[PDB]
Structures are given as structure tokens and as C-alpha cells.
Design a binder for this molecule. Sequence first.
Ligand SMILES: CN(CC[C@@H](Oc1ccc(-c2ccccc2)cc1)c1ccc(F)cc1)CC(=O)O
Length: 518
Amino acid sequence: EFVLTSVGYAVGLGNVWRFPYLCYRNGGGAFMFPYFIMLIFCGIPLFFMELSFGQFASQGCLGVWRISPMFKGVGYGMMVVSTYIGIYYNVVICIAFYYFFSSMTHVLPWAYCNNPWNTHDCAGVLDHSLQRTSPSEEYWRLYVLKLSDDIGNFGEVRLPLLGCLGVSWLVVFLCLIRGYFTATFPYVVLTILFVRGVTLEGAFDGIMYYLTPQWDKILEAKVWGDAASQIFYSLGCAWGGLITMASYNKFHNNCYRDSVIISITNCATSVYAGFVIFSILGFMANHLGVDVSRVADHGPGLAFVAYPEALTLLPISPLWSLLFFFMLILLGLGTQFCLLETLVTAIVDEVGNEWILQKKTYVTLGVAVAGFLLGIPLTSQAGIYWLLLMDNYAASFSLVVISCIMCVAIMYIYGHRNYFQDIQMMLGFPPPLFFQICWRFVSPAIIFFILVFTVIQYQPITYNHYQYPGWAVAIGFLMALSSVLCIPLYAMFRLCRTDGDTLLQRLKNATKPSRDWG
Ligand SMILES: CN(CC[C@@H](Oc1ccc(-c2ccccc2)cc1)c1ccc(F)cc1)CC(=O)O
């Protein structure tokens, strides 16, 4: 039953919710081909490299950087990325909590729009007018989240969402002191949703659009940069917990097969989620009158505008809605629990002897209470504006760069021959020929090419799919740089303390693997 265990290791909210909206924003058909190219060459070998690095020396996200102590800032940068996804991941779960709790009525609220909080922009299937909105979209954009016209419009804090955030954080916190249905449940619900949709009118037009590619946007750096964003965010690379949970693996394990299987099931689940989502989008375009490419607003909420519509059409809809949103909550809670456990362990490990080690529960409460206070702005009226900016800036591309430096920290600093000999001690065979060439040359250079295009050469004002004010993009750029500046700054700190005068010969000393390594 190893496949079942590997199936539930990779499935989370990073592909059920993030992948559909990312694909729709990037065009769908023009995103899968870059996604498929990115997954095979840079993201499958990086996953294996991270797994092997964690498995060889049993150490957490940091502390394992004795292969090159000067680059210990890479591990610190990983926790900064993990922290950023630790304060807005819950808000995704909290919206699921609001949707889960609101489905207990006789009928789902997002079924008929004869409600006080709608305008005359409704089409309806169970029921002057231009660009009609789906009944589920208005219930989301006007009741679940009272939207504002700009980021600087906090206004009134949404009380029910604040309560849901408190409940979710308390549930996560109480699941840390105390310690089927986890890998087959998401697939059953996704299959049930797949039987629906594809049998509805106009669904095929929204299916090909998800598949057929356009040879016009495959050259732009935005699509390739975002494809690496999803292939890394939804795979756990550079998150920080990939190495930490790999530390508990045995020495003579088979990390190659584990990595291959986990990546394959993750990609298959992401493709299945996209296939289910785009089935509904075609039906929405057919019944609304607009085309598929303009039927849903490009933004963080697409799993809450497309999925709820599908569940409505099913017989005895409230039970199916409860099951689906409970599945989403379970996946989000599992991923958040893993992330918080890894962060708490990494923080706790490198502190003083006893006064901040035996009282691990208190520091866990402090971490679990810092996220709640930091998550209050995300639950306000201008909530998804901040979450989307945090998603698209903080944990969008840094995960690539932080990993890319890793791919250079061992192959061209530690020594690729030394690392290749190191894996041969783990297994009965040396690393496969595909991973040897891809690690050294094919993968990192590709990242650098994006770093050549998406940074300086090809960054017009068009690189903002939305229209944020100057302060918003400034804070987003600072957040993006906050998780990457930890690598050169820690190197400078090491160079300021290392013993020596030339500091060129000592640069070898500061990068030579430590005696603790092995
Ligand atoms: C897709 N999610 C990643 C889930 C998980 O990824 C795994 C990685 C590795 C192993 C594993 C464990 C033991 C042995 C072998 C492999 C399991 C799961 C992870 C969670 C938090 C992190 F910080 C990093 C990774 C994130 C999302 O939901 O977007």
C-alpha cells in the first residue's frame, strides 16, 4: 500500500485551489505545455535532490547545511518562505470553513440568486443586462467577501471570516499538542465531480481550451516563470518541510522511487483538478453567453466560484457540498499541520538548553497565535487583494531561486562527483543518467534563463495582471526579496566573522564541508 501513502503525501490545497486559477490566469492551454516541460526537467530532479539531501544526513530544514556553512542562509530563507505560506494558507482553509458551515441549510445558498445581496446580473439554470454573473460568483464576491475597489480600502473587518480564522487556528494548534479517508477521499469526490460537468451542454468547448496549446505565449517569460511557480509550490520544494520530513526516512531507503511516484501522483492530481474545473467553465460560458476565456475573473478565487456551481447540479446537493468542503478542509489542515510542525521543530532545535526547549508547547502557542494576529488583515474587506499579492509575490518565484541556489550549492561548490558518490552509498545503484545531466546543466540554467528574462530584460508594466498602487507593489517586491536576500546577507555575516586576513583562502574554509557532515 505504498502507492496509497505516496498519493496522500503530495495532494493538498496547492493543486485543488491554486492550480485552476493559475492555469486560467495564464490561459489554460498555453500553461499546461510549459507546466509539463517544467515538471519533467526542473522539479522532478530537484525533488529527488531535496529528498536525498534530507535522507543522507538526518537534519531539519537548516542544520543540514554543513555541506556549505556559508550558504546556511538558504535554510533561513526557506523558513521565511514557509512563514509567508503559514499566514495565508489558513485563509484559504477558513473560506472553506465558511462554505462548509453555510452548506448545512435545506438548500445550498449559491443555488438560486433570489437574495437581497444580488444585482440584476443573473442567468441561472435552476431558476438591460450585460456580462451576467453566475449565482455562485455573486454570493462569493458580495456576501462571503464584501469586495473593495482598491487595496487601501480595509473598511470593515468581516466578522464571520474572523471567527472562522480563529476556529481554524485553534483546531491546528490543538492538533499539535496531542501529536483510507486520507488518500482515497479526494479522488472519490473529484471522480464524482468529473462524471458531472462533462455531460452538460457546452462542456467540451471548455475542455479543449484547457488542452490545445497556443504557440504565441510559450515564448513570454511570464508563463514560464509561473509554470515553475506551480511546479514548485504544489510539490513542496523549497518549502522547508521537504527536507525535515525526509530526515525521518531510513538510510537504506529508495528515495528515487519515492520521489518519482510522489511527483507523478501530484501532477496527475493537478491535471485531474484542472480537468474538473475547466469542465464547469465551458458550461458557464455556454449558459452565460460570454466565451470561456472571459467567463471568470482572473484572481485567487476560482475554486470557490467553479466548484460550488458543480455541486449544486448534483442530486441532494447539501450532502455533496458538505463532503467536498470537508475534504478540502482536511487537505488544508493536513498541509498546514505539517508546515507548522516543521517550522516549530526548526525554530526549537537551535535555541538555548532548557528554558526554551522543555516549554515547546508555549512557543508553539506563540507561533499559533502570531499567525492569527497576522491574519486579521487577510480577513478584512480588502482580504483577497492582500492574499493574492502575497501569493503572487512572496511564495511565487523565490521557491525557484532558493532551490536553484541549492542546485548550485552541491554540484558546483560541494562537488558533483562527491555528491554522486554519496548517493551510491544510499542505494545499490548510482543516480540514473537522466538525473546526472539534468542536475548539473539542464535544470539550473533553465531557471537562470527565466532569471535573465523575467527580472531585467522583459519586465514592462504589463507584468502586473492586476492594477495595484505603488505601495502595494513595493511591499510585494520587498516580500519577494525578503526570502532571497537571506543567502547573500548570511554569506556576508560569515565572511565578517571567519578567521583570516585574505578572506580568499578563508572563502574555501567558509565553504568547505564541516567535519560534522557524514
Ligand atoms: C503540496 N503540498 C506539499 C505537501 C508536503 O509534501 C511532501 C514532501 C515530502 C514528503 C515525504 C515525507 C517522508 C518521506 C518522503 C517524502 C511528504 C510530503 C509538504 C508539506 C509542507 C512542506 F513544508 C513541504 C512539503 C503543499 C501544498 O499543499 O501546496
